[PDB]
Every structure is written in C-alpha cells, then in structure tokens.
Amino acid sequence: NDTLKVMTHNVYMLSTNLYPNWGQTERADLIGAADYIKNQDVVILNEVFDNSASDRLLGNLKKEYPNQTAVLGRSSGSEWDKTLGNYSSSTPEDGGVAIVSKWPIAEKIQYVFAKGCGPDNLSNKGFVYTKIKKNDRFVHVIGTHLQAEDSMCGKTSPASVRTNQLKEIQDFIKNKNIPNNEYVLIGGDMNVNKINAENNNDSEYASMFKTLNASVPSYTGHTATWDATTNSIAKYNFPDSPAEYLDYIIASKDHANPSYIENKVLQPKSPQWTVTSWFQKYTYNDYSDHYPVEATISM
Ligand SMILES: [Co+2]
Numbered sequence: 001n002d003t004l005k006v007m008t009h010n011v012y013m014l015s016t017n018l019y020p021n022w023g024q025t026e027r028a029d030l031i032g033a034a035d036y037i038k039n040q041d042v043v044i045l046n047e048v049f050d051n052s053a054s055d056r057l058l059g060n061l062k063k064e065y066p067n068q069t070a071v072l073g074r075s076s077g078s079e080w081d082k083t084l085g086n087y088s089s090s091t092p093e094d095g096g097v098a099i100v101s102k103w104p105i106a107e108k109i110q111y112v113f114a115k116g117c118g119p120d121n122l123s124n125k126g127f128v129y130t131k132i133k134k135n136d137r138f139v140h141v142i143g144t145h146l147q148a149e150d151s152m153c154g155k156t157s158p159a160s161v162r163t164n165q166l167k168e169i170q171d172f173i174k175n176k177n178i179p180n181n182e183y184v185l186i187g188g189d190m191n192v193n194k195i196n197a198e199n200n201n202d203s204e205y206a207s208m209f210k211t212l213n214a215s216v217p218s219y220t221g222h223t224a225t226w227d228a229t230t231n232s233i234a235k236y237n238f239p240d241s242p243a244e245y246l247d248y249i250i251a252s253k254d255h256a257n258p259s260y261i262e263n264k265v266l267q268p269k270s271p272q273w274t275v276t277s278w279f280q281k282y283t284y285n286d287y288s289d290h291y292p293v294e295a296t297i298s299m
C-alpha cells in the first residue's frame, strides 16, 4: 500500500528475579491484547528482559505478528543468522531487544555493543537487525536500546558511550551493503533527549542524526515518551523528574529517503492492575513507564 507502519515501545519488563512486583506477567497479557500495538507492519520492543514474561508477550503477539526474532543477547544459536559484537553467554541479563512483524523476516542479526558505562558487559546491550519482505519490497529495521544515564561511567560520559554505540550501528549499516533504494530504519529508546534541544545544532539530539546519517522525522502526538507527569509508573519511580523525549524511529539518508516520515507519541492507558511492594499496594493504568512511538513512513 506504499505505507510502512513501525512502532517501538520500551515495555519495562525487568527481571522478576530482581524486581518481583512490577506486574511483568500481567502486563505481558495486557500489552499483548492492547489496541495500540495492533495494525503495525513491524514492532520493536525494548526492555523485554524477564525471560518468562517476554516469551509470554511474544506469544501473545504471535497471532498478528508471527514473524519474530529471539531476544537480543539471550542465546546465540541458529535462531540468529549472525551473532555480532561483544556477545557473552555468561552475562547476568540479556539485551532485552526484539522485533516482531506481520511480514516474513528474511534475515535476523543480533549485535552486542563494544562498550557501555562500566568495564563489564552484564546485559549484552546492542541492536537487532532485520531484513523484512513487506509486500514485494525489502525493508530493513534495526531495533536498539542505548546506554542510559549513569552517575558512574568511568572517565567517559553516557553521551560519549551512546555516540560510540550509534557509531557501531552506522558502521554495521554501511558494511551491510544494503541497496540505496531500500528503506533502512533505526528505532528504539535512544536515551537521547529532544526536549529543549530541537533547535540546538550542537545538542546530543542533533548529533544522533549526524552519527547515524539519518533524517529528522515530523513529530506528532504527545510531547514526551518518558513522562512522570502523566505516566503512573514513571510517577511512582521518579515523581519530580521532568518529562523527557527519548524514543525514535528514523531513516538512514544513505538509503531510500522517505518523502514523509512521522513519529507519533501515543498515550494508551492499560486496564487497571495492582501489585504489592513491601506491604504496600499500588495500582497502575499504564503498560510501561515509557510511551510507544508510532511511525508512518511513506514509501
Ligand atoms: Co527503563
């Protein structure tokens, strides 16, 4: 139909071995049945860390999105066409990134970043590359989740680490020799804040597009993707943190340049769910502490 619909959503599914009461299992069902995640061509998921809940979610999304990748950094067998980067089978946690699609996935590649804040690789953070055949056309979708802000980051800063991670993504894209007439999208929680930096050509926000050689999309919908002022989980965790705009889906300019590409932030609310933590009961109506970003790409 000459329109590509891609969504990315950091679903906040921390391991239940470390965070027992965040309703991971129930939200796997709520998200899986949610209306906001339907009718897409491809969906990028971030933070699908908990093994049981993530597999449950993927299972719930199987009907509409039967073509799925394994979760970044959880395994390294034939389920991946290639396992690149600093992959380690002994990390305490996986990368929490996965891509599902209603269309056949021709190639699945996982790549683990060389570095992050801290000298050790304890989560195989990185990206997932997919070559997808969407109605007689091959599109390329890379899903990722970049280094978060960390008080401790050695002699380097979170921004410098993210730039290096973005560099690995771009270097991989160039090396792949993808036809320049096919669409190449990079999406996920970049942990790069757009708020108050959209007009600053020197902001980390501006550098993101330069490093990935990507174009800037048209922005619609809500004004933030991690908002403690409207999101129930974010409010619980960080009541006074200003809203931030951290999730994106952008296109490589070294390939097919979309005549139009939009990133819309949605604010879907989930059915009410409750958890008990330290003898105190809490109720929420959000699927995650992050809001999903829905992209419309004209092809
Ligand atoms: Co998070």
Ligand SMILES: [Co+2]
Pocket (backbone or CB within 6 Å): 015, 048, 049, 050, 051, 074, 093, 094
């Ligand atoms: Co895991």
Ligand SMILES: [Co+2]
Pocket (backbone or CB within 6 Å): 226, 290
């Ligand atoms: Co976050």
